[PDB]
């Protein structure tokens, strides 16, 4: 929210790093179930989708304006799974992604990336 | 194309074709092996039982995937040869494929 | 029609009760009823039966059951592999096993439940049956051990006297061993 | 690199077996034929050679 402010009235281009989000949902979960709301796959509270709309969705480029808010946050889903529901819903939510994979990493090639599942 | 056995017996070869060579000048025949492949127009090489047609590794070390004459069994000269004939067949089947 | 030897139910029974008589379709499709498929079946039971076993039947009795089972056993892992060559690239005794095997499978096995003559037995009946089948086989081996014609043994009239054996009726059963048996002794003398 | 996940795959990976299992079932009885044809070659080999060597 310090981003809209720097973006919209004062004109800037701002790259925002929200590194790690996996702790997010973790804490999120806690309130969830400690109250009583329903689970909805893998025991993350099911309304997740919405809360994870509001974080990524603010950004973009306003009309006939100046400025920019580009978000790169970095997920840290466990294992090299791709159906642990965190990175799941992010998938719809953000547009595209690029993956690091152990797949390369053993070979020592830095900074690994694969093309194979990066859309953008 | 080519073969070897003792000179004393070799002559016969030497008549029609079989531009053979000695076979008691080496008891390794590797020497000959290579020489043979120098021209390589000989797709046939065969040897007596004087050597043994079992350590082909020479050929494998030289041809190295360029299949060139399988060393074939001859036998110095008949005096009996039919005993180990039906044998040579059986000796093969057990250690190839499956054992009976 | 969960179709396994693994879903709870079965492997529970298996735990408590003692004997398992597996029946299976496959063996059955070739025809041979009952089709209790032996190779997968078991019965922990036998042990404690041995006393009464030996009392009543014969007294060399156990020694037979264990002896004969080996037959099929030593066919199972021979056939398995080597049978993708038929019964002609085998050697001497090799054929002998499965020829005998045939007999274990063409008589000692398969009965029927549609014969007044046979669909019922008693110990003492079967005993002779099995007895003969070792007793023809050990001497079958004395033939091939001298290298006699093999595929001749396989055509001798003696086998037919086995061939009828199941059909032998229970009143005639004693006698039928009586003549038949000692004849075995004599078919090997012939060669 | 990855342990296969936790759902979807049951059916697919079972049909992995269906293909494999049936494939490898039959690959043998593919091969049975060639073993037959090996025999054809096996008889034939030395016959005359050994003969006409000797005179």
Swiss-Prot record, chain A:
It comes from the Bacteria. Disulfide bonds: none annotated. Produces ATP from ADP in the presence of a proton gradient across the membrane. The V-type beta chain is a regulatory subunit. Belongs to the ATPase alpha/beta chains family. This is V-type ATP synthase beta chain. It comes from Thermus thermophilus (strain ATCC 27634 / DSM 579 / HB8). The gene is atpB.
UniProtKB/Swiss-Prot annotation, chain B:
One of its GO terms (biological process) is proton motive force-driven plasma membrane ATP synthesis. Pfam families: ATP-synt_F. GO terms for molecular function: ATP binding; proton-transporting ATP synthase activity, rotational mechanism; proton-transporting ATPase activity, rotational mechanism. Gene3D superfamilies: 6.10.140.810, ATPase, V1 complex, subunit F. It comes from the Bacteria. InterPro entries: ATPase_V1-cplx_f_g_su, ATPase_V1-cplx_fsu_bac/arc, ATPase_V1_fsu_sf. Keywords: ATP synthesis, Hydrogen ion transport, Ion transport, Transport. Belongs to the V-ATPase F subunit family. Produces ATP from ADP in the presence of a proton gradient across the membrane. This is V-type ATP synthase subunit F. It comes from Thermus thermophilus (strain ATCC 27634 / DSM 579 / HB8).
UniProtKB/Swiss-Prot annotation, chain C:
Produces ATP from ADP in the presence of a proton gradient across the membrane. The V-type alpha chain is a catalytic subunit. Belongs to the ATPase alpha/beta chains family. This is V-type ATP synthase alpha chain. It comes from Thermus thermophilus (strain ATCC 27634 / DSM 579 / HB8).
From Swiss-Prot, chain D:
It comes from the Bacteria. Produces ATP from ADP in the presence of a proton gradient across the membrane. Belongs to the V-ATPase D subunit family. This is V-type ATP synthase subunit D. It comes from Thermus thermophilus (strain ATCC 27634 / DSM 579 / HB8).
């Amino acid at each position: 929210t310090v981003a809209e402010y720097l973006a919209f009235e004062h004109d800037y281009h701002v790259l925002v790093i929200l590194t790690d989000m996996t702790n997010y949902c973790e804490a999120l979960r806690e309130i969830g179930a400690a109250r009583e709301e329903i689970p909805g796959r893998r025991g993350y509270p099911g309304y997740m989708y919405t809360d994870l709309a509001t974080i990524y969705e603010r950004a973009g480029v306003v009309e006939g304006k100046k400025g920019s808010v580009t978000q790169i946050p970095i997920l840290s889903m466990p294992d090299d799974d791709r159906t642990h529901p965190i990175p799941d819903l992010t998938g719809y939510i953000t547009e595209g992604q690029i993956q690091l994979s152990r797949e390369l990493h053993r070979k020592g090639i830095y900074p690994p990336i694969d093309p194979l599942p990066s859309l953008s | 194309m080519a073969v070897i056995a003792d000179p004393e017996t070799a002559q016969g070869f030497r008549l029609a074709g079989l531009e053979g060579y000695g076979a008691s000048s080496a008891e390794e025949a590797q020497s000959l092996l290579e020489t043979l492949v120098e021209r390589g127009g000989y797709a046939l090489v065969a040897v007596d039982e004087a050597l043994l047609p079992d350590p082909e590794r020479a050929v494998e070390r030289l041809m190295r995937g360029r299949d060139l004459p399988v060393l074939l069994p001859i036998a110095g000269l008949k005096e009996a040869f039919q005993g180990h004939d039906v044998e040579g067949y059986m000796r093969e089947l057990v250690r190839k494929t499956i054992g009976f | 029609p969960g179709g396994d030897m693994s879903e709870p139910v079965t492997q529970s029974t298996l735990r408590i009760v003692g004997a398992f008589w597996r029946l299976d379709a496959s063996l059955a499709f070739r025809r041979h009823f009952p089709a209790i498929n032996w190779n997968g079946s078991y019965s922990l039971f036998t042990s404690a039966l041995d006393p009464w076993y030996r009392e009543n039947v014969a007294e060399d009795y156990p020694e037979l059951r264990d002896a004969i089972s080996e037959l099929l056993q030593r066919e199972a892992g021979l056939q398995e592999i080597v049978q993708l060559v038929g019964p002609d690239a085998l050697q001497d005794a090799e054929r002998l096993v499965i020829e005998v095997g045939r007999i274990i499978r063409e008589d000692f096995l398969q009965q029927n439940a549609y014969h007044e003559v046979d669909a019922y037995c008693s110990m003492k009946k079967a005993y002779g049956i099995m007895k003969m089948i070792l007793a023809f086989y050990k001497e079958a081996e004395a033939a091939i051990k001298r290298g006699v014609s093999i595929d001749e043994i396989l055509q001798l009239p003696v086998l037919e006297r086995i061939g009828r054996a199941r059909y032998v009726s229970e009143e005639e059963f004693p006698a039928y061993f009586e003549e038949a048996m000692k004849e075995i002794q004599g078919a090997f003398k012939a060669l | 690199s990855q342990v296969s996940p936790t759902r979807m795959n049951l059916l697919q990976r079972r049909g992995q077996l269906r293909l494999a299992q049936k494939g490898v079932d039959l690959l043998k009885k593919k091969r049975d034929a060639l073993v037959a044809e090996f025999f054809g070659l096996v008889r034939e080999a030395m016959e005359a050679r050994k003969a006409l060597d000797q005179a």
